[PDB]
Design an enzyme around this catalytic site. Structure first.
Site, mmCIF file in Angstrom:
data_model
loop_
_atom_site.group_PDB
_atom_site.id
_atom_site.type_symbol
_atom_site.label_atom_id
_atom_site.label_comp_id
_atom_site.label_asym_id
_atom_site.label_seq_id
_atom_site.Cartn_x
_atom_site.Cartn_y
_atom_site.Cartn_z
ATOM 1 N N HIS A 15 0.798 -1.224 0.000
ATOM 2 C CA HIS A 15 0.000 0.000 0.000
ATOM 3 C C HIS A 15 0.831 1.274 0.000
ATOM 4 C CE1 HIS A 15 -1.583 -1.186 4.321
ATOM 5 N NE2 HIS A 15 -1.386 -2.335 3.716
ATOM 6 N N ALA A 16 0.751 1.971 -1.114
ATOM 7 C CA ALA A 16 1.576 3.132 -1.417
ATOM 8 C C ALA A 16 1.429 4.272 -0.420
ATOM 9 C CB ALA A 16 1.296 3.620 -2.830
#
Length: 88
Positions: A15-16
């Site tokens: 998850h960026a």
């Protein structure tokens, strides 16, 4: 310079967004932290590797902090990385 090999706990797929907080965290240190994850080595405050980081559970990532505040960056890095789930 010091290395930190981290065993990720996230299985969601990195998850960026968490990593973008890492981005701003690494941005404010003297030291440059390199993120080395199996072919992907990148300036950790730069998204040019970090944004496509394919880390999941078995992914052990190695951080290299080099700077005048590298060990300190390391100790902060571990805290934020565990908060962000890129390590236990």
């Amino acid at each position: 310079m010091e290395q930190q090999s981290y065993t990720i706990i996230d299985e969601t797929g990195a998850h960026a967004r968490p990593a973008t907080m890492l981005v701003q965290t690494a941005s404010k240190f003297d030291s440059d932290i390199q993120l080395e994850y199996n072919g992907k080595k990148v300036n950790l405050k730069s998204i040019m590797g970090v944004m496509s980081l394919g880390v999941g559970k078995d992914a052990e990532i190695t951080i290299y902090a080099d700077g005048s505040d590298e060990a300190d960056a390391i100790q902060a890095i571990t805290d934020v990385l565990s908060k962000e789930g890129l390590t236990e």
